[PDB]
């Protein structure tokens, strides 16, 4: 499987929930980001496909106040803007 390299701010977010490396598979990037969203309770308790991130570092990195987990192409594009070229 192909390895990708996070920029310094995205790297610090993954290491806050146990990550130990400088490079990752895309399945590993999605594992640590999901664990981050659930331990900080950023998902809406009633409608659980909505993530609210205005007052979190995740909102500064992605450039939005909120997003839907149904929008698969938009989420892969937000991750790509945060990888080393």
């Amino acid at each position: 499987e192909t390895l990708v390299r996070p920029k310094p701010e995205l790297l610090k977010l993954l290491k806050s929930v146990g990550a130990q490396k400088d490079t990752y598979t895309m399945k590993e990037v999605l594992f640590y980001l999901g664990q981050y969203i659930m331990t900080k309770r950023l998902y809406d308790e009633k409608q659980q496909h909505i993530v609210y991130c205005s007052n979190d570092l995740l909102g500064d990195l992605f450039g939005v106040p909120s997003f839907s987990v149904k929008e698969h192409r938009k989420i892969y594009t937000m991750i790509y803007r945060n990888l080393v070229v």
Binding site: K27, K70, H72
Partner: peptide
């Protein structure tokens, strides 16, 4: 939970 089931669908696209 419902969040974990929506997030598993992204995993399928990798």
């Amino acid at each position: 939970l419902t969040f974990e089931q929506y997030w598993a669908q992204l995993e399928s696209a990798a």
